[PDB]
């Protein structure tokens, strides 16, 4: 059910981990990135709006997607980590580190770790207001 490769060589997928403070995506694709293998989101696994982001959501999501892909013949994963970017947080959400750890537990091989958060040269104005968002 997948590529034909010997025991020594590992098939590389590429993993996009998207961690906001809202919810996390663990999304695995081809090397090209033009074909998605599998996509599991932090809020699909657990039901609540509060739990969408939390490290547990990423745990579940990652275990599941890494399972489904361990099915289809991808042992190794190149990882491109993401924070929401743009005008907003460059800091990665809480779910990412826990998700990566999680699908590392699942028996998957890890490729090169890259950090891509879209980073402006210079941005359009931020979503708040002069005095900021107060609360």
């Amino acid at each position: 059910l997948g590529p034909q490769v010997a025991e020594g060589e590992n098939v590389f997928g590429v993993c996009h981990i998207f961690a906001s403070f809202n919810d996390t995506f663990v999304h695995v694709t081809d090397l090209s990135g033009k074909e998605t293998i599998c996509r599991v989101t932090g809020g699909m696994k657990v039901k609540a709006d509060r739990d969408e982001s939390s490290p547990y959501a990423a745990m579940l999501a990652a275990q599941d997607v890494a399972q489904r892909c361990k099915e289809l013949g991808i042992t190794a994963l190149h990882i491109k980590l993401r924070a929401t970017g743009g005008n907003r947080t460059k800091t990665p959400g809480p779910g990412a580190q826990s998700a990566l750890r999680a699908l590392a537990r699942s028996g998957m091989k890890i490729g090169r770790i890259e950090d891509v958060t879209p980073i402006p040269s210079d941005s359009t104005r931020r979503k708040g207001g002069r005095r900021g968002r107060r609360l």
Binding site: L1, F12, D30, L31, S32, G33, E35, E114, D115, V116
Partner: protein, 213 residues
């Protein structure tokens, strides 16, 4: 309902003759239903590959954008597209007490390929230096800038894509620029941080065949 993953097929992306290691990997493409040719949908991909993976001895932070063009029947022919530095390296260089210097050139190679070449350099702290900061006056900076421009322009303009990428792999160009500008100011880390592609020549099979082997 119906498994989309049984209509998929596996192909092999292999790099050009430029580097050492050939097979970069596998690519997954849905089979031809006759309404859509799978050879065509597979024709436009960019592949982000670390230099350490293509050639065994080199640094990890150099990434190459490689484009598929022709498919050989489970063999994908890839031609050079772009080059860039890993974000991490880029940030690792930039610091708060040094002047940064940047420039870029748009050069047509001898085979017609059109490239935007970017260059990044830094004022280096001298070895016995007591003064906290290393800063280049604006005129010095303009000078260095001009010389970078000159150098890489001269390097690419004379040669075709082949030799160009061959110079890009170890990055001869960087050490070149460092060396030459030592009179103006002791530049520190100097790279081609990015390579872009503007205009490719009209596609020809033979050229690519030569490039692969």
């Amino acid at each position: 309902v119906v498994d989309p993953f049984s209509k998929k097929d596996w192909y092999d992306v292999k790099a050009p003759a430029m580097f050492n290691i050939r097979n970069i990997g596998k690519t997954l493409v849905t089979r031809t239903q006759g309404t859509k040719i799978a050879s065509d949908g597979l024709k436009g991909r960019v592949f982000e590959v670390s230099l350490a993976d293509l050639q065994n001895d080199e640094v990890a932070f150099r990434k190459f954008k490689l484009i598929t063009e022709d498919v050989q029947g489970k063999n994908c022919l890839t031609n050079f597209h772009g080059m860039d530095l890993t974000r991490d390296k880029m940030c690792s260089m930039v610091k708060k007490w040094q002047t940064m210097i940047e420039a870029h050139v748009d050069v047509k190679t001898t085979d017609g390929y059109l490239l935007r070449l970017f260059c990044v350099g830094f004022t280096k702290k001298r070895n016995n230096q007591i003064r906290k900061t290393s800063y280049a006056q604006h005129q010095q900076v303009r000078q260095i800038r001009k010389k970078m421009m000159e150098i890489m322009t001269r390097e690419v303009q004379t040669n075709d894509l082949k030799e160009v990428v061959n110079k890009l792999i170890p990055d001869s160009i960087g050490k070149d620029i460092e060396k030459a500008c030592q009179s103006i100011y002791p530049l520190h880390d100097v790279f081609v941080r990015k390579v872009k592609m503007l205009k490719k020549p009209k596609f020809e099979l033979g050229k690519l065949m030569e490039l692969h082997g």
